Design a protein around this nucleic acid. Structure first.
Length: 99
DNA sequence: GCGAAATTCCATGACACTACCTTCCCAGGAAACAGGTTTCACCAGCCAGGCCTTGAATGCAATTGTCTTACTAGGAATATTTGGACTTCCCCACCTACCATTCAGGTAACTTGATACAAACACAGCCC
């Protein structure tokens, strides 16, 4: 067990999966902060909410990727309509028990 | 010819300079703190009477402010003379960076120990 946890596999994973598109908009949002960018107006982080139906991006810049900076960023966007599913990454701000 | 065994094959992944940074979690405990209740005693607020200190008015005395003159020394310019700070070049010892080893201290605990505070009665010093 000194040689099992250092050598890496020479066996690639198989074919990638293409999951199907949803059949309506407002079904899957794919959200991920970008940044730290170069600063402007006291902003560094930009929430990016892509619709999984189309590609229709939504931008909601914030000061710092906290939980509450995301929550008010979607209250603008939940004013439009309500999604069923929101995908993300396992972010520092999304995995919080508050969010 | 099947199976067992000895061998060659080939598709692939990771190495490329790396740590911080942010936000949320966890956590245990604790930090007190912010919050709040409770009660007793005390310090602050209240008001007036008497006296002393301050303010003012003053007269005057010397203190101080101005004027004037003879002058001493300061400053500047000089030459020079002299006294040194820093730039320079080089080497060694000393500080550091390191690991291993160990000792000492801080926390911590249980005990002990000792002193200060709170209370009471009296004494002495100073003042009215």
């Amino acid at each position: 067990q000194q040689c099992l946890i250092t050598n890496a596999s020479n066996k690639a994973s198989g074919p990638i999966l293409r999951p199907d598109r949803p059949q309506k908009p407002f079904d899957k949002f794919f959200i991920d902060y970008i940044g730290p960018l170069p600063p402007s107006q006291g902003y560094l982080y930009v929430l990016v909410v892509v619709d999984g139906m189309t590609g229709f991006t939504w931008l909601y810049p914030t000061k710092a990727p906290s939980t509450s900076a995301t929550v008010k960023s979607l209250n603008v966007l939940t004013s439009i309509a309500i999604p069923k599913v929101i995908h993300s990454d396992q972010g520092a701000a999304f995995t919080s028990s508050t969010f």
